Amino acid sequence: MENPLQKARILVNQLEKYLDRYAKEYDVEHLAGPQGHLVMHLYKHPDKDMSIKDAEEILHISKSVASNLVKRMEKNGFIAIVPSKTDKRVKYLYLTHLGKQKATQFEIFLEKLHSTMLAGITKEEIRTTKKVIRTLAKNMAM
């Protein structure tokens, strides 16, 4: 008589469009997913080294994905990839000047995005919503 599926897909689509437009305004296109995670990780932990191997573990991705991801981040100019001097088979990642800028813009983006999105919704309402979604998922799992 009525369909919450189509309703739900329309909403997720809207959310994606919203997110994309918002990211463009903050000039952090590309950072929405795993690029942004890695940029923010590198940005928050600049004392420490990160090999591609480390990035695999931190993002929980495969060798081929991590490989593609970092090559694209290098293309973007967000990171440098420099082989270990001692063992030129270990590859270390360095967040560039541009990568640091991208990180600072991403943080602002995230702050403003949540303020806009979550206006007039309480921490409790969120907790409730999260419990419901999560009970639904469980109820379906056969």
What residue is closest to ligand HEM based on CB?
1
Binding residues for ligand [C-]#N (CB under 6 A):
2, 4
Neighbours of 116 (CB within 10 A): 10
**Number of residues engaging a copy of itself in binding (CB under 8 A):** 40
Question: Please, where are the H alpha helices in 33-122?
Answer: 34-44, 52-59, 63-76, 97-117
**Nearest-angstrom CA–CA distance, 30 and 28:** 6
Supply the minimum distance, in Å, between the C-beta of residue 93 and ligand [C-]#N: 24
Q: Which of residues 27-56 bind ligand HEM (CB under 6 A)?
A: 32
Flag whether 114 is marked binding.
yes
Out of 25, 27, 33, 71, the only residue in the binding site for a copy of itself (CB under 8 A) is: 33
Site string for ligand HEM, 86-115 (x = CB under 6 A): ------------------------x---x-
Place of tokens 């991801």: 69
Q: Single out the residue of 58, 52, 119 nearest to residue 89, CA to CA.
A: 52
Sequence-distant (≥ 6) Cβ neighbours of residue 117 within 8 angstroms: 18
Burial of residue 124 (CB within 10 Å: 0-12, 13-18, 19+) is exposed
Q: Single out the residue of 63, 64, 68 nearest to residue 35, CA to CA.
A: 68
Listed ranges 9-17, 67-75, 86-94, 97-105: which one lies at the site for a copy of itself (CB under 8 A):
9-17
Q: Which residues bind to a copy of itself, rule: CB under 8 A?
A: 1-3, 5-6, 8-9, 11-12, 14-16, 18-19, 21, 32-33, 36-37, 40-41, 116-121, 125-126, 128-129, 131-133, 135-137, 139-140, 142
Binding residues for heme b: 1, 114, 123
